[PDB]
């Protein structure tokens, strides 16, 4: 039965944790909006081998996930859960969190994402050979851009993306349920205080993030079966652990 002061202290703790682990400051991403890949640079990316483009993207994704791991480490209540449950939650939620975080680096006006120093369209990623997945991820970021999340809202929402008591394999489900509820109280309190409860009905359907993650695992299966040695030799060990079957 967390008190109002405890709920308020949770809001602050979650928001602080996100600030410390956000990977790139929002202002930096916004400042870079006019730095867009040229037609020649786009073509250069498109003409990369499938293996090199997958390898680059796997490294960048691993980097982004490492920040999400640090977010969880600092998240009030997460370290209180048993070791098994920490693992279950991060293994399922890490990628979901990255997909939400991406909207900050997404410019809806020209439908570009910040990638390797400049903004580029989904055409940048053609060499991967998973255009449907990329389009679905860009559609997802475009949908989130319409919500106009503040930094604090992203912090509170990504905490809830991670603390999801519906994941199978939890040893202490009721403990996770209790933390989830308190984080829900923290989110809703912050939203009520800022007149932003209207966003709740517009948040992605919960099956959405799961679906994007399954699609990503499936596209890696297609790539890995075609280039198994490249993945074994060159891909980050954390990436394989999280995503390979």
């Amino acid at each position: 039965y967390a008190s109002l002061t405890e709920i308020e202290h949770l809001v602050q703790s979650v928001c602080k944790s996100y600030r410390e682990t956000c990977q790139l400051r929002l202002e930096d991403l916004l400042r870079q909006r006019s730095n867009i890949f040229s037609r020649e640079e786009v073509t250069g990316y498109q003409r990369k081998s499938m293996w090199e483009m997958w390898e680059r993207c796997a490294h960048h994704l691993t980097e982004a996930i490492q920040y999400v791991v640090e977010f969880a480490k600092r998240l009030s209540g997460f370290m209180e859960l048993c070791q098994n449950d920490q693992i279950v939650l991060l293994k399922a939620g890490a990628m979901e969190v990255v997909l939400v975080r991406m909207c900050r680096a997404y410019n809806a006006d020209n439908r570009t994402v910040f990638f390797e120093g400049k903004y580029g369209g989904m055409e940048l990623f053609r060499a991967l050979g998973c255009s449907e997945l990329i389009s679905s991820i860009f559609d997802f970021s475009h949908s989130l851009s319409a919500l106009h999340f503040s930094e604090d809202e992203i912090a509170l929402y990504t905490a809830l993306v991670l603390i999801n008591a519906h994941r199978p394999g939890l040893q202490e489900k009721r403990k996770v349920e209790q933390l989830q509820y308190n984080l829900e109280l923290a989110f809703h309190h912050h939203l009520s205080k800022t007149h932003r409860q209207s966003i709740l009905a517009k948040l992605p359907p919960k099956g959405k993030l799961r679906s994007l993650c399954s699609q990503h695992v499936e596209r890696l299966q297609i790539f890995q079966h075609l280039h198994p040695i490249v993945v074994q030799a060159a891909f980050p060990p954390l990436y394989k652990e999280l995503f390979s079957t």
């Binding site: 490492q66 791991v69 480490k73 693992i87 060990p237 954390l238 652990e241």
Partner: peptide, 8 residues
Amino acid sequence: TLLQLLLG
């Protein structure tokens, strides 16, 4: 696991 290591 690696997640275990990264978490301590």
